[PDB]
Amino acid sequence: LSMTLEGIQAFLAQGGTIEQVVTEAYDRITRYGDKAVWIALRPREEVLAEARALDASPATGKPLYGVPFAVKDNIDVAGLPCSAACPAFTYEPDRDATVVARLRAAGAIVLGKTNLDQFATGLVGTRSPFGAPRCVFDQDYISGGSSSGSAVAVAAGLVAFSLGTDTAGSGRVPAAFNNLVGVKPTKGLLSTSGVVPACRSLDCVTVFAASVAEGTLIRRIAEGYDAADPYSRPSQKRRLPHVGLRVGVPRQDQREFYGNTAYAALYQRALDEMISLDAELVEIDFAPFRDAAKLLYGGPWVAERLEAVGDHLSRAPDSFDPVVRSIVETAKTLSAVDAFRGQYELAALTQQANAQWARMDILLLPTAPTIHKVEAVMADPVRLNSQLGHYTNFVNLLDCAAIAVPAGFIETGLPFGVTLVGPAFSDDSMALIADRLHRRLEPGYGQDRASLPDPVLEETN
């Protein structure tokens, strides 16, 4: 059994059952040796019962017929608790989050709730009372976060896809550290109703998948206007060129890796391989994107998180992970004046970014500048985390779409990923470009660099 959309469809087609798919997933879950992946797992027998019921129904109109998935524990799934990795926060949602409801109606099956950095605050994966999920290539290394368990579960073949959320960059960072495709839809496309807020105005539901095509199908299914969510936006499609594509990259002197020379080398290598794609590389000034990024935690947007968990925080700050607690407690000193100043700075930076967008169709970045051992992060938990947001943190502030794809491996055996960044609503066009890049650079996914499921994406157009 290949745990991908294609693998499962194929296994079912050749006489296999959903019940067997679930059995195998559970077998894999039981043998996987990372104690931090899951916060709350369904009992196998109840999932088997759901498997059977579905087995006995038509596959018609269910594009995700019998497909197991994991859901990050800041996203509501009826019948399981939801905690945002904060035991004191724990509640029992009556209803599936909207995106979950849509995926399940397409026939997908929830296996359990995956671990995360608490209140989706962190890019490391280590800020959880449940322990730190680990890089699937080396247990000494961070899985990345905050969608830590979701990425690990897919890369380890436990489920075919997973949901996370992305605010600072969590749709992308743990995809890179675990050799996955991370689809980060334009904000507002997928409902955040039934999702615990982090930065409410910025939060996106995000997809971890084995390929761009599979991630894209999952995204489209989950996508849809939802008036319950104040930030929901109806879909638009903005097209990007294919013939004549211009790919922006930062200036040489803007390529920061915080000492990681292997990562620097692999980024350059990606650029080297790209001359055989039908694309032109354009050096752009990355500064306005870089400075916009800093506003997320270095500016007043952190106050959004304080809004989200402020009741629990004042009630009992000791209930909080100590690093997250400290970050959100500091936000308390920001005024409305600070918030508007941040907005003014963002508006100006947006002007400057727009001038750079005039030069390129899409931006190509290291997903992260480096990767860290868990032990290194525990010793230096704020600073080393912030490094990981160097290239990610402007994306939702500047209303962009993004896709993280595998770009290769350094010699010590750790993955290196890159991220494509495009303007709002360019999600479909980006999917095509990303698929092409992925299949050019590092055409496999997950812990075994496994064969990518078909189909490859083709020009519509």
Next chain:
Amino acid sequence: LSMTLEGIQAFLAGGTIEQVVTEAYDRITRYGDKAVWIALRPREEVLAEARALDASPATGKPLYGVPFAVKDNIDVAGLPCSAACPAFTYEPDRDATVVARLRAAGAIVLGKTNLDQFATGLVGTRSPFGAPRCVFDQDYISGGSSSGSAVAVAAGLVAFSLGTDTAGSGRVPAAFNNLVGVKPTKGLLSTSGVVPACRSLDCVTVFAASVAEGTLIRRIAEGYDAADPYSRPSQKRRLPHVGLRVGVPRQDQREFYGNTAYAALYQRALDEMISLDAELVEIDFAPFRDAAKLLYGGPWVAERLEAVGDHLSRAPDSFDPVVRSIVETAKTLSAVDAFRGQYELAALTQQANAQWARMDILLLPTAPTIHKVEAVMADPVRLNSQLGHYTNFVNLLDCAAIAVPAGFIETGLPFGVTLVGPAFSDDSMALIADRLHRRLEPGYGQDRASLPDPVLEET
């Protein structure tokens, strides 16, 4: 001389710009409202500029020789700028962008007009220089914050003026002085060289004798300006003219705070509209109403604190007492309060969008009532807030607006209405507003004077 774009072009077509200026100054000297101007150029210097222009070709100058007034929160080189706060006063080295563009089109600045201090108020009374008055009755407020700008045009002192609109000042003093107020989609006109009030919401606004004239001035001043972080490139969103749906609030949402004459005149406007080619649609005005409340009732007031915070901490007694207390109170707002306001706005935006699905344009009383200056002096916060009832959502919900005369109540006071449309609907709105104006109350200013041509036509 008729002090309109058309009146001036006609007069020049053996008259001179020098004569135009002379006449404007003669009118300024006679007018009799001591509160209209903060800083007037010396006649002699304007005359010299007039002569130099006279000797220039009119080619390429669509506002060839046209006098205008500029609100004193907008920079004009060679005059001070104070936002009606003497301690704030500075001497700008350069014209604000919009001023630069207008002067390049041949228009001539006569002076800086009085305003509510730091553009904070809809009354016109919050100025140390005194309260300019309704041109129809000295006992009544001119409205604000663009108080002097509106009076100067309605009194025939200048052919148009610039103000700024945040809460509603492009509209309220237009209503109270029988003028067209054009309120451009935010970002269209640069706010560079304009003192911020709510930086992210502020609009340069135009007071004119007609929609067409106000529209020409708007287009000339319009243009992307990277110096302004909130500047946006022109887009144009079209509205229908055949099949037009005009939303109005539900009967029970038509608030006039006891002013039954205004209520009667609003209904009258609806009564006359059956002979325009438009359908009236009752809409739920609640989400617009509740969004309006966020401007001063929510965290946006903190934007004003951001703008004048240094001066306020240096010397709060340097501030108008009402403006001072409003901005001092903003000090207690956190970033958390600011984000909650945005969350509330985003939700209210969802609900408003559902109403927008039912109409092309919204038609409102410009203000629910009008007040005697003395009434406002006694009750300066409450009575002001009333005036924002229909205006205050417009920049928060990213809308365009035009205020046009809608008639007069029996006691001789004007009553104005405002058309509200989606962002970038400015050109299509102008056509609708022109039609409505000419249907309801086809005159402008203190004399209900003949509207200059042209009438706007569909294209």
